Amino acid sequence: VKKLINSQISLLIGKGLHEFDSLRDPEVNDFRTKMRQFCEEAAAHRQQLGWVEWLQYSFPLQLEPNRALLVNVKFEGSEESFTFQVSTKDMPLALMACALRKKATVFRQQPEEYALQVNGRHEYLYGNYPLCHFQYICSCLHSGLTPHLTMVHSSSILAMRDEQSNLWSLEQPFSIELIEGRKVNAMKLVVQAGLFHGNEMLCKTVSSSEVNVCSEPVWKQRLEFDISVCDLPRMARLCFALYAVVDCPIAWANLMLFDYKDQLKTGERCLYMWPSVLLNPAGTVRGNPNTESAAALVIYLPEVAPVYFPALEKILELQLQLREILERELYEHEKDLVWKMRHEVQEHFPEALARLLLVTKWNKHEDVAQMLYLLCSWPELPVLSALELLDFSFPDCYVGSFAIKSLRKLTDDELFQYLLQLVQVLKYESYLDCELTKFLLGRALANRKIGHFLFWHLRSEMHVPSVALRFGLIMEAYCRGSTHHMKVLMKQGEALSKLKALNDFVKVSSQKTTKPQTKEMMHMCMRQETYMEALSHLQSPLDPSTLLEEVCVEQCTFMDSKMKPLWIMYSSEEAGSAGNVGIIFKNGDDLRQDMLTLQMIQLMDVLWKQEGLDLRMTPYGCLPTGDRTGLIEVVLHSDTIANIQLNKSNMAATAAFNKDALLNWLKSKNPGEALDRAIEEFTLSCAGYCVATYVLGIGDRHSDNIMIRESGQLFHIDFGHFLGNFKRVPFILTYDFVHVIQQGKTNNSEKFERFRGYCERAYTILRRHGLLFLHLFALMRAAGLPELSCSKDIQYLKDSLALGKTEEEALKHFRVKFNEALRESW
């Protein structure tokens, strides 16, 4: 039971719990105890919530950011369904009320006691919301499908809640002694050290002498730094870099001079180094776990006298004219100006806190103590301000603790929109228990959808040693917190476990035998008991509310590309057509870049919708779940503009010229005046994806990676190369699109200038929120993507949105780019 839950978590996280105990570190032991307690208290509250409050945890509503419609309804036990026609503006209780009135006539004799469950889905309909605000209903409007829902009584929800139960005196200069190590390289060796407190150095760099190449070396040199022992800030970071010289990089290593309990670190320390591709402060403050092959370094940290960092009480005891002109990087005369006027910054420019923190001297403990005094009575800044404060440039913990006080006011949906970045910031952390972790973990245990996504965001990075312990430990506390969801997640891992083995079997066979022979062999490998049991009946990792019930083996296949991605189709009896959903399993390519690009498109859709403009965007699911291994959501009822341009023999869209093909495919898929809606659908999405790709700098755009839905909506795929790193992009407007936009006419400036309008409106709304994009991409520098490595990459976004201009200039300049693509298009 306890052993059963323990051996489950080990299988689930992919690391044995004993592997934590083997280290015997009191931090890891303190983390595991302090968290377990926290998450168990979270689970205790969760068990005594109301039935409607449990639905908000387990099935959080899926809402969007007059004209009646057909609706199907039924009850939990029976299969007898009733069909209604009710308003888009009707509340779910008005619908529920009818469902009782129809049973009152057939069955022959209280709405608030029930909830509306979406058939064959982990989605419910409740609350004070008109039915056109739900995703499943709004989906059914556009798509023309019929909502089929089940009436679940309060006691039936409560039956689940029960079954889903578990000091300043040290003025001497700072110094350390570089003793000895052990490595392999072909010259002489040097050991450049250097202190830091974020990206900035606490003092100058101090390189060692030249020892020879043949080495298991010894130095024993007292390296003295240009900073006092009391001047050191609580989050002081000492880095090191080993390299050969006649340059030749070899390895790096870092550590916190203070321990986790606030005490200075003592005498001798062994530091196992990580390999290089000159100095790296961002790199983790934990030794290389490959204790064997990793080159080590023993160093001595002098005995200064027990010295803890001072408590807050001790830290608490210790013209406005040309001020604004600069406040909108800065010179030293300006930096001094900003530090001098720090009180009026709190009292009349609180949102400038970040620019003020960067001017303070962290290598002089007076300026630090004076800054921390202001921060204790600084007002709550908005969410965008707090996001700026979570970057690597503000390592101080009182800042971090403040940013979390500000972030606490995030909506469960905004948290989900930012969660990816919040996880990459966990890499920057110095100690295991922290606010961010405690916060994420608490939000995760109050929302099963956050719990789900946070879990896969951690699990997908376990193959990386820099974070294996950190994440493994976090996932463990989540599993202590949600013992029922843990089991739900194990079924997904085991599905993914089989999907891996199936894809290797698919990779070999496809080389040897032909495609159809590999296909019937894939189907046979699938028909087995283990595969049918493992790949069936599970919540989708791409979306916890979608249920991947029965696998339709006949339809499952694999795309003919390189990594042979598996196409896996499903179907549900209960959900009907809403259960017929597919997934794509890729193996051997990292999908974290695709996930970020899709997050950015999903944000752009949300920003535009929030300013009344729906461009009919398609931010389909993409989810890394392991080492070069994730899931992509099959977008159904769509084809590539390459397959449509094949102009296939005796089809419903036989066209004479390529330019007409696109439009002819639309005419066949949408008969009557449905075509007018499909062209309107095409036009907005076309305008949408033109702006998103321009801004995100997505290149290598060809007919085989631009799709189009049967509804008319245009959408892009393969987001492996962005920010103009093919693996400065121009604006794109293919002639075949301009034809469909212009209703198939050579001249239609009425419909074209409308389209141009959408591209301009969308471009500006993004520019307004250019900081949000900057602050989210700023935190992702922690991930370690090849194309989001440095400031030069971020710069692409600054220059694409032109944040260093006015709305006149930016739109004046953007109007030229559009014309330059319009002209280039034949």
Residues of the shown chain interacting with ligand K47 in the complex, contacts defined by CB under 6 A: 557, 559, 565, 567, 584, 591, 594, 620, 632-635, 638, 640, 717-718
CB of 717 to ligand K47, least distance (A): 4
Q: Looking at this protein, which amino acid is placed at residue 371?
A: M
- Smallest gap from Cβ 695 to ligand K47, in A, equals 19
CB of 622 to ligand K47, least distance (A): 6
In the bound complex, what is the minimum distance in angstroms from residue 645's beta carbon to ligand K47? 13
Question: 562 CB contacts (<8 Å, ≥6 apart)?
Answer: 588
Of the pair 557, 645, the CB lying nearest ligand K47 is at 557
Taking the C-alpha atoms of residue 622 and residue 596, their distance in angstroms, rounded to an integer, is 9
The torsion angle over the Cα atoms of residues 233, 235, 238 and 239, rounded to 10 degrees, is: -140
Residue 233 in tokens: 């800030």
Q: Min. distance of Cβ 704 from ligand K47 in angstroms?
A: 8
Contact 277, 300 (CB under 8 A): no
Shortest CB 590 distance to ligand K47, Å: 10
- In eight-state DSSP terms, residue 104 is I
Q: d(Cα 713, Cα 591) in Å, to the nearest integer? A: 24
Minimum distance from residue 514 beta carbon to ligand K47 (Å): 16
Q: Which tokens sit at 554? A: 């006949």
Least Å distance, CB 53 to ligand K47, is: 36
CA distance 522 to 517: 9
Amino acid identity of 171? E
Shortest distance in whole angstroms from residue 513 CB to ligand K47 = 18
* CA atoms of 546 and 539, how far apart (whole Å): 6
* Closer CB to ligand K47, 492 or 638, in the complex: 638
* Residue placing its CB nearer to ligand K47 in the complex, 557 or 625: 557
Name the amino acid, one letter, at 350: P
Give buried/exposed letters for 567-599 (b at 16+ CB in 10 A, else e).
ebbbbbebbeebbebbbbbbbeebbbbbbbbbb
| CB 201, min distance to ligand K47, A | 40
Please measure the distance between the N-terminal and C-terminal CA atoms of the chain and give it in whole angstroms: 70
Cβ proximity to ligand K47, 99 vs 622, nearer residue: 622
Closest distance to ligand K47 from the beta carbon of 552 (Å): 11
Query: Looking at beta carbons only, is 476 or 594 nearer to ligand K47?
Result: 594
Q: Which two tokens stand for residue 709?
A: 């839905």
The SS3 of residue 697 is coil
Measured from the CB atom, is 476 or 633 closer to ligand K47? 633
C-alpha torsion sign, points 522, 528, 534, 536 = positive
Instruction: Considering the complex, state which of residue 34 and residue 628 has its C-beta at the smaller distance from ligand K47.
Output: 628
Task: Give 177 or 550: the residue with its C-beta nearer to ligand K47.
Answer: 550
| Contacting residues for 192 by C-beta, under 8 A, at least 6 apart | 205, 206, 207, 208, 240, 241, 243, 278, 279
DSSP 644-678: HHT--TT-TT--SSHHHHHHHHHHHHS-TTHHHHH
- Please report how close the Cβ of residue 594 comes to ligand K47 at its closest, in angstroms: 5
Q: Which is nearer to ligand K47, 686 or 717 (CB)?
A: 717
Minimum CB–partner distance for residue 651 and ligand K47 (Å): 16
3-state secondary structure 614-642: CCCCCCCCEEEEECCEEEEECCCCEEEHH
Contacts 24+ apart (CB under 8 A), 219-222: 219/178, 219/179, 219/180, 219/191, 220/177, 220/178, 220/179, 220/180, 221/177, 221/178, 222/175, 222/176, 222/177
Do the beta carbons of residue 244 and residue 186 sit within 8 Å?
Answer: yes
Q: Which two tokens stand for residue 646?
A: 């094949």
Report the residue number, 707 or 782, with the smaller CB distance to ligand K47: 707
Task: Considering the complex, state which of residue 73 and residue 707 has its C-beta at the smaller distance from ligand K47.
Answer: 707
Nearest-approach distance from CB 761 to ligand K47, in angstroms: 27
Among residues 433, 421, 366, 434, the alpha carbon closest in space to that of 391 is found at 421
State which residue, 217 or 630, has the beta carbon closest to ligand K47: 630
When the beta carbons of 116 and 556 are compared against ligand K47, the nearer one is 556
Q: Counting every residue, how long is the chain?
A: 826
What single DSSP character describes residue 234? Answer: T
Least Å from the CB of residue 559 to ligand K47: 5
Rounded Cα distance, 440 and 446, in Å: 10
CA 786 to chain centre: 17
